């Protein structure tokens, strides 16, 4: 599923990402935007054997566990395929844990490079919250 900006923004508010641990909804839409371009089926295999899954490109070495990643910590207690769902619940549930892990949203490169210290609220702008 390829979400649309406003749609996903609403879905994320739907799931409590609106102002979660200091992060305004804008940050999450922007992070999704650059991490997967709102594509929930987005997967990025790494040379290191792991793979990033879903709308927020969660990594299979630390958060989810596919069936092909030695040492996977699987901290989000979910098969990575659940991050490829049209329903963002699993990704969000994981993202909240990840953003609480101590590095903030800096846990996502894409977010750091294209959203950090930027007018993020612009991504929820023009939407029906």
């Amino acid at each position, epitope marked *: 599923k390829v979400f649309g900006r406003c749609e996903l923004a609403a879905a994320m*508010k*739907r*799931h*409590g*990402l*609106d*102002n*979660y*641990r*200091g992060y305004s909804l804008g940050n999450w839409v922007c992070a999704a935007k650059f991490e997967s371009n709102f594509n929930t089926q987005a997967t990025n295999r790494n040379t290191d054997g792991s793979t990033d899954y879903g709308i927020l490109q969660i990594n299979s070495r630390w958060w989810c566990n596919d069936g092909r990643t030695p040492g996977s*910590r699987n*901290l989000c207690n979910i098969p990575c395929s659940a991050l490829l769902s049209s329903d963002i619940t699993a990704s969000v*549930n994981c993202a*909240k*844990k990840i953003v*609480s*892990d*101590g*590095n903030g949203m800096n846990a996502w490169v894409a977010w750091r490079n294209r959203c950090k210290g930027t007018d993020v609220q612009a991504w929820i702008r023009g939407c029906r919250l």
Partner: antibody
Amino acid sequence: DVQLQESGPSLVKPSQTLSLTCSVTGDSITSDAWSWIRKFPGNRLEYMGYVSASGSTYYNPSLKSRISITRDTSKNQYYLDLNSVTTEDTATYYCANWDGDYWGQGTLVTVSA
Amino acid sequence: DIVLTQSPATLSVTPGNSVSLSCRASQSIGNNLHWYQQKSHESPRLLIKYASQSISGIPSRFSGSGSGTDFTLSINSVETEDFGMYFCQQSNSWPYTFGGGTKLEIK
């Protein structure tokens, strides 16, 4: 399978550090975030703070530098070091993983005169 | 600091009757609300995660609902051992906070 065992002096004196230990069984402390929660008389619970699975710690601003959560990655247990407590700090201290799934039995550590 | 006001403070009931517990946030917290059961001489137990998500092992008669600022825990056909404290907790903003608690007891 998973068990959170709390131990430590259930009675400390004014001005000195309140220290508690939470032994974790069936689950390595680096594979989960862990916290300390205390219940004050009158069912007043307080989230003291926590250590992430990656070592980042978070402390409830209510404590103010008085709190230090550290962990023993070898014996697989973590601690609570609360400086200069007072009658106020008297409560039952709990340790549970971040997700809320596991908890320690709960140990009441009072601080009377 | 997000405040959680639970009501009623106490709630008496006869096993078999159904109850509805309330938890209101002094600020919209999305769905970052969690429910705990607290029996005397015992430690909090996670009943409902994120407003309504069920916890493997918790009896079906338990269920949560709500969003934003108002949340509800529903216990249908309360049983003799469902009696105890009930606390809600927001994980939305740091420092995480707990509700004042609703004491469920026999009529």
